Design an enzyme around this catalytic site. Structure first.
Site, mmCIF file in Angstrom:
data_model
loop_
_atom_site.group_PDB
_atom_site.id
_atom_site.type_symbol
_atom_site.label_atom_id
_atom_site.label_comp_id
_atom_site.label_asym_id
_atom_site.label_seq_id
_atom_site.Cartn_x
_atom_site.Cartn_y
_atom_site.Cartn_z
ATOM 1 N N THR A 91 1.185 -1.139 0.312
ATOM 2 C CA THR A 91 -0.150 -0.216 -0.332
ATOM 3 C C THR A 91 1.000 1.419 0.129
ATOM 4 O O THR A 91 1.003 2.030 -0.693
ATOM 5 C CB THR A 91 -0.793 -0.133 1.185
ATOM 6 N N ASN B 184 6.194 -0.779 3.545
ATOM 7 C CA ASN B 184 5.298 -0.344 4.860
ATOM 8 C C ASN B 184 6.348 0.035 5.865
ATOM 9 O O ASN B 184 5.486 0.162 6.488
ATOM 10 C CB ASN B 184 4.391 -1.522 4.613
ATOM 11 N N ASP C 194 25.701 0.510 -15.290
ATOM 12 C CA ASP C 194 25.435 -0.150 -14.560
ATOM 13 C C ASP C 194 25.489 0.485 -12.851
ATOM 14 O O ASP C 194 25.457 -0.481 -11.875
ATOM 15 C CB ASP C 194 24.023 0.951 -13.921
ATOM 16 N N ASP D 59 25.622 4.427 -16.632
ATOM 17 C CA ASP D 59 27.088 5.563 -15.787
ATOM 18 C C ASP D 59 28.336 6.546 -17.039
ATOM 19 O O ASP D 59 28.390 6.244 -18.352
ATOM 20 C CB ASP D 59 28.172 4.542 -15.699
HETATM 21 C C1 LIG Z 1 -0.161 6.720 2.681
HETATM 22 C C2 LIG Z 1 -0.288 7.392 1.175
HETATM 23 C C3 LIG Z 1 -0.088 8.472 1.034
HETATM 24 C C4 LIG Z 1 -0.430 9.764 0.619
HETATM 25 C C5 LIG Z 1 -0.770 8.898 -0.986
HETATM 26 C C6 LIG Z 1 -1.575 9.288 -0.626
HETATM 27 C C7 LIG Z 1 -2.285 9.363 -2.084
HETATM 28 C C8 LIG Z 1 -2.680 8.864 -3.504
HETATM 29 C C9 LIG Z 1 -3.135 8.750 -4.335
HETATM 30 C C10 LIG Z 1 -4.208 8.742 -4.049
HETATM 31 C C11 LIG Z 1 -5.094 8.217 -4.297
HETATM 32 C C12 LIG Z 1 -6.097 9.080 -2.191
HETATM 33 C C13 LIG Z 1 -5.115 7.845 -1.380
HETATM 34 C C14 LIG Z 1 -5.337 8.744 -0.324
HETATM 35 C C15 LIG Z 1 -4.863 7.775 0.582
HETATM 36 C C16 LIG Z 1 -5.758 8.070 1.901
HETATM 37 C C17 LIG Z 1 -5.577 7.328 3.340
HETATM 38 C C18 LIG Z 1 -4.193 6.445 3.150
HETATM 39 C C19 LIG Z 1 -3.797 5.695 4.498
HETATM 40 C C20 LIG Z 1 -4.580 4.870 4.195
HETATM 41 C C21 LIG Z 1 -3.263 3.536 4.868
HETATM 42 C C22 LIG Z 1 -4.202 2.444 4.840
HETATM 43 O O1 LIG Z 1 -4.671 2.168 5.830
HETATM 44 O O2 LIG Z 1 -3.028 0.956 4.542
HETATM 45 C C23 LIG Z 1 -3.930 -0.164 5.379
HETATM 46 C C24 LIG Z 1 -3.598 -0.872 5.231
HETATM 47 O O3 LIG Z 1 -4.069 -2.565 5.128
HETATM 48 C C25 LIG Z 1 -2.333 -1.712 4.097
HETATM 49 O O4 LIG Z 1 -1.396 -2.883 4.692
HETATM 50 P P1 LIG Z 1 -1.505 -4.044 4.002
HETATM 51 O O5 LIG Z 1 -2.022 -4.492 2.918
HETATM 52 O O6 LIG Z 1 -0.192 -4.635 3.920
HETATM 53 O O7 LIG Z 1 -0.030 -2.400 2.247
HETATM 54 CA CA LIG Z 2 24.254 4.713 -13.060
HETATM 55 ZN ZN LIG Z 3 -2.970 -0.941 -0.607
HETATM 56 ZN ZN LIG Z 4 -3.748 -5.638 2.059
#
Ligand SMILES: CC/C=C\C/C=C\C/C=C\C/C=C/C/C=C/C/C=C\CCC(=O)OC[C@@H](O)COP(=O)(O)O
Ligand SMILES: [Ca+2]
Ligand SMILES: [Zn+2]
Ligand SMILES: [Zn+2]
Ligand SMILES: *[C@@H]1O[C@H](CO)[C@@H](O[C@@H]2O[C@H](CO)[C@@H](O[C@@H]3O[C@H](CO[C@H]4O[C@H](CO)[C@@H](O)[C@H](O[C@H]5O[C@H](CO)[C@@H](O)[C@H](O)[C@@H]5O[C@H]5O[C@H](CO)[C@@H](O)[C@H](O)[C@@H]5O)[C@@H]4O)[C@@H](O)[C@H](O)[C@@H]3O)[C@H](O)[C@H]2NC(C)=O)[C@H](O)[C@H]1NC(C)=O
Ligand SMILES: CC/C=C\C/C=C\C/C=C\C/C=C/C/C=C/C/C=C\CCC(=O)OC[C@@H](O)COP(=O)(O)O
Ligand SMILES: *[C@@H]1O[C@H](CO)[C@@H](O[C@@H]2O[C@H](CO)[C@@H](O)[C@H](O)[C@H]2NC(C)=O)[C@H](O)[C@H]1NC(C)=O
Ligand SMILES: *[C@@H]1O[C@H](CO)[C@@H](O[C@@H]2O[C@H](CO)[C@@H](O)[C@H](O)[C@H]2NC(C)=O)[C@H](O)[C@H]1NC(C)=O
Ligand SMILES: [K+]
Ligand code: NA
Length: 779
Positions: A159, A180, A659, A667
């Site tokens: 995520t 993560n 690289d 490089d």
């Molecule tokens: C955390 C990322 C930070 C910034 C990115 C933000 C946005 C990216 C682009 C577009 C859509 C908007 C997303 C905004 C996200 C908001 C909520 C952010 C984080 C919630 C994280 C979360 O709830 O993870 C749940 C876990 O089950 C994941 O664990 P895994 O299943 O092991 O990966």
């Molecule tokens: Ca390089």
């Molecule tokens: Zn996810």
């Molecule tokens: Zn997950």
């Protein structure tokens, strides 16, 4: 200190930036324990739920209700999303026929179509097949808008790396969120998806879309939602923001759902239990679309429906344990599961023995369900090495499996695997005035989306790893007009200036239109090279690196493969157009006990014996470990011809890549760290080949009227074949398997070589950019 005695009255989910001493009323306030004392009371009402019922129509407004069904709710922007349907006889958006939206139809005061990004966690691409029976709102978005069959996430397919890649257009190794969980040896600190360390800004690199927007005077809604806030409240908040005064209203919005990921972990991706979560997400999309319709915005806004990664069947019964391979696993820390990263338990423990560990993990079980790699040996397509937070030792884990440190169920699904694995692919749909109508587009990589979101918002993207213009085909308007890079170094076209007697190299031996179908590559750095023409091939020979930067030839489908005669086994010849001083020498090869050599144009595909002697030219030779030669010879002798037969001829460009610092970029001389024994002939870390043909296979490659087809590879130049557990067998049993793992985009090769390909074609530059980003996955 933050003074929490203040009040959130009139302030709920304010977009205003608020720092301590003042207390806050936004999404981040809980993580900082900075909420005003009445935030939960005023801003998180839940009374009466999220839906109007007939019995609520034209109620007197009670401000204690979660949403409203009173007559004034519309003007105030806080109706329940189904208010008009229940109270005013309207239709749900999903029940309305799809109609093309040729231009934005936006209310008074809207200057551009807002963008709403609707992200769903763990939404496997194949879930879409469930269709309107399960997800009628989503199916409408998909069928009526623009959709890809899938979108490729970045590795690791978890995520945090993926959401931040969506936001930045960067590979994890560049944006810094490489997992993560991660340890940074310079901070001596550890980042976890849960907990407070992640809130520190030092972890987060690049420039995410909300900052790009803000810096360019475009206002953004929140891109973070507290876990305690229900999805219905997230949607109502977005809709309320869209109802704001012209001078307050944001242009870009984000929604996030932690489903269907949670249920995928619990039940696995093919579980019957997955229907309910998928229905729930669809209901939320429905609330959004109904709400937008209430606001007269449903033909105004651009909506992106996008996942972060997919989900695979993974159970407790399929776990490898390192304790089965290693004697003392209590002395290591493993980032475990669907990938492995290994470091000593005690940072900088001097008795850490990585070569011994890797040896014990290499091809030790016939069915071994993971493979160890030093990070510089990972497939280059993963772009997963250039960051101090990425441990040197990595385990690439087989799909459906886990790796754990030791033995010392509740889960049936997981993800994190190699991003070309089918189960890891995720979703993309774009719907709205700026997207195309009822259009399907090929799969593409999530790194490309930041540029497109910048396009949809009128923003100039920060430097990123997308290839701007490669997704122009998704868009009705707002496309980016790309411009061809300017060549930096023009070549020399040297004729003969020497005689055979001129060379003391230690050797012994007892067009452009035809061989460069898409034009010669432009060299985008300062260097000195010669175009060399031959009957059967052309090359750009570097006077600095003492070998071609590229060798280009076309092979007809009917082409005939010849053997190399026994007397010509060690034939290498001087090249009379190139100086002795700018040439390799065979004495170094005879003298280096470990390094042999190979040829970029294979003698096996010579047009004639006279021509075949050109293949033995010293300027067609490159340094190759015997282990690599096993691979290259099989490719040159067997596979190239096989591609020509299957594809109706192919045009091949092959060359070396350097690289040494594993940053995915060409490089400079200073960076090259290995040379043939006793010499200044540099040793490539990889060899590439780009193989192109007509998409319409009925036409031969040299007579192609229309779109092209391409597959490319970046093969690691290693002294052994330890990566291939079956390499003791005939090459027919393992080489292609290796090659598939190291498939690559043309764009990857461009970064690594400083070359620019396909400059002379009959296709648009945009189409060519799409071609360059294509990855042949063999899935
Ligand atoms: C955390 C990322 C930070 C910034 C990115 C933000 C946005 C990216 C682009 C577009 C859509 C908007 C997303 C905004 C996200 C908001 C909520 C952010 C984080 C919630 C994280 C979360 O709830 O993870 C749940 C876990 O089950 C994941 O664990 P895994 O299943 O092991 O990966
Ligand atoms: Ca390089
Ligand atoms: Zn996810
Ligand atoms: Zn997950
Ligand atoms: C994918 O696209 C990106 C973006 O264009 C390319 O990454 C860029 O590569 C160039 C050339 O190597 C680097 O240029 C150098 O810049 C540094 C100064 O950079 C500092 O300031 C810039 C601008 O504000 C900032 O972006 C840099 O951020 C890096 O370092 C931060 C602090 O440690 C870190 O938090 C952030 O994540 C990022 O780290 C990554 O890059 C560094 C190298 O800078 C690397 O060590 C680390 O492991 C990460 O990979 C930084 O504060 C000058 O000293 C040099 O003169 C030179 O100009 C860019 O810095 C770099 N940009 C980013 C954001 O990574 C990739 O090459 C491209 N990949 C491929 C394969 O094409
Ligand atoms: C909840 C916090 C989540 C995300 C914060 C997101 C982006 C932060 C953007 C800029 C601050 C990051 C700084 C990182 C510092 C150095 C590397 C570049
Ligand atoms: C923390 O917040 C409260 C609420 O604003 C502040 O309380 C006010 O403070 C001034 C004191 O000069 C009084 O005149 C008001 O009556 C107070 N209002 C209420 C509603 O309590 C308090 O001052 C703040 N604490 C600080 C600044 O340290
Ligand atoms: C790699 O595996 C071998 C076993 O194949 C380990 O060798 C064992 O080491 C212990 C003490 O080091 C010896 O007393 C045992 O007799 C060895 N086992 C066997 C079956 O021969 C070796 O320790 C492992 N190396 C690492 C780094 O884990
Ligand atoms: K040798
Ligand atoms: Na092997």
């Amino acid at each position: 200190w933050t003074n929490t005695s203040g009040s959130c009255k009139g302030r709920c989910f304010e977009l205003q930036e608020v720092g301590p001493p003042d207390c806050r009323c936004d999404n981040l306030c809980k993580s900082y324990s900075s909420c005003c004392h009445d935030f939960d009371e005023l801003c998180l009402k839940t009374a009466r739920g999220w839906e109007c019922t007939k019995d609520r129509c034209g109620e007197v407004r009670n401000e204690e209700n979660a949403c409203h069904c009173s007559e004034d709710c519309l003007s105030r922007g806080d109706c329940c999303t189904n208010y008009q349907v229940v109270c005013k006889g309207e239709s749900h958006w999903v029940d309305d026929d799809c109609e093309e939206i040729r231009v934005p139809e936006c209310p008074a005061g809207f200057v551009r179509p807002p963008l709403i990004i609707f992200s769903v966690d763990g939404f496997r691409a194949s879930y879409m097949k469930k269709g309107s029976k399960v997800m009628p709102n989503i199916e409408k978005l998909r069928s009526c808008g623009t959709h890809a069959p899938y979108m490729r996430p970045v590795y690791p397919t978890k995520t945090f790396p993926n959401l931040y890649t969506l936001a930045t257009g960067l590979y994890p190794e560049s944006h810094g969120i490489v997992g993560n969980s991660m340890y940074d040896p310079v901070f001596d600190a550890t980042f976890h998806l849960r907990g407070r360390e992640k809130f520190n800004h030092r972890w987060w690199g690049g420039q995410p879309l909300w900052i790009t927007a803000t810096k360019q005077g475009v206002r953004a809604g929140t891109f973070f939602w507290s876990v305690s806030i229900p999805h219905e409240r997230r949607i109502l908040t977005i809709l309320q923001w869209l109802s704001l005064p012209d001078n307050e209203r944001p242009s870009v919005y984000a929604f996030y759902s932690e489903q269907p990921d949670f249920s995928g972990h619990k039940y696995g991706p093919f579980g019957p239990e997955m229907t309910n979560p998928l229905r729930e997400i669809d209901k939320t999309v429905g609330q959004l679309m109904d709400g937008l319709k209430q606001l007269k915005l449903h033909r105004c806004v651009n909506v992106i429906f996008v996942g972060d990664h997919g989900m695979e069947d993974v159970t407790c019964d399929r776990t490898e344990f390192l304790s089965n391979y290693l004697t003392n696993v209590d002395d290591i820390t493993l980032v475990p599961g669907t990938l492995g990263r290994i470091r000593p338990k005690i940072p900088n423990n001097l008795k850490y023995d990585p070569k011994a560990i890797i040896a014990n993990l290499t091809c030790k079980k016939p069915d071994q369900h993971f493979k160890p790699y030093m990070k510089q040996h990972l497939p280059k397509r993963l772009h997963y090495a250039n960051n101090r937070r990425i441990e040197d030792l990595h385990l690439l884990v087989e799909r459906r499996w886990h790796v754990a440190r030791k033995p010392l169920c509740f889960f049936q699904g997981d993800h994190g695997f190699d991003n070309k694995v089918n189960s890891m692919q995720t979703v993309f749909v774009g719907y709205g005035p700026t997207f195309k109508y009822r259009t399907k587009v090929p799969p593409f990589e999530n790194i490309e989306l930041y540029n497109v979101m910048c396009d949809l918002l009128g923003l100039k993207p920060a430097p990123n790893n997308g290839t701007h213009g490669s997704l122009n085909h998704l868009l009705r308007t707002n496309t980016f007009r790309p411009t061809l890079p300017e060549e930096v170094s023009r070549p020399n076209y040297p004729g003969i200036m020497y005689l055979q007697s001129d060379f003391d190299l230690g050797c012994t031996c007892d067009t452009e239109e035809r061989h460069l179908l898409y034009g010669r590559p432009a060299v985008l750095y300062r260097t000195s090279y010669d175009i060399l023409y031959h009957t059967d091939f052309e090359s750009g020979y570097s006077e600095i690196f003492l070998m071609p930067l590229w060798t280009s030839y076309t092979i007809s489908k009917q082409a005939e493969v010849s053997s190399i005669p026994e007397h010509l086994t060690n034939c290498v010849r001087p090249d009379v157009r190139v100086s002795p001083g700018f040439s390799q020498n065979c004495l170094a090869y005879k003298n280096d006990k470990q390094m042999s050599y190979g040829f970029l144009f294979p003698p096996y595909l010579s047009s004639s014996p006279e021509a075949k002697y050109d293949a033995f030219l010293v300027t067609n030779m490159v340094p190759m470990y015997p282990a690599f030669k096993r691979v290259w010879t099989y490719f040159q002798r067997v596979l190239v011809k096989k591609y020509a037969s299957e594809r109706n001829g192919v045009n091949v460009i092959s060359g070396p890549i350097f690289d040494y610092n594993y940053n995915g970029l060409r490089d400079i001389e200073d960076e090259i760290k290995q040379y043939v024994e006793g010499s200044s002939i540099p040793v490539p870390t990889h060899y590439y080949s780009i193989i192109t043909s007509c998409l319409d296979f009925t036409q031969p490659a040299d007579k192609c009227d229309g779109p092209l087809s391409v597959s490319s590879f970046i093969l690691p130049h290693r002294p052994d074949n330890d990566e291939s557990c079956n390499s003791s067998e005939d090459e027919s049993k393992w080489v292609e398997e290796l090659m598939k793992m190291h498939t690559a985009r043309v764009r990857d090769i461009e970064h690594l070589t400083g070359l620019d390909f396909y400059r002379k074609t009959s296709r648009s530059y945009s189409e060519i950019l799409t071609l360059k980003t294509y990855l042949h996955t063999y899935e």
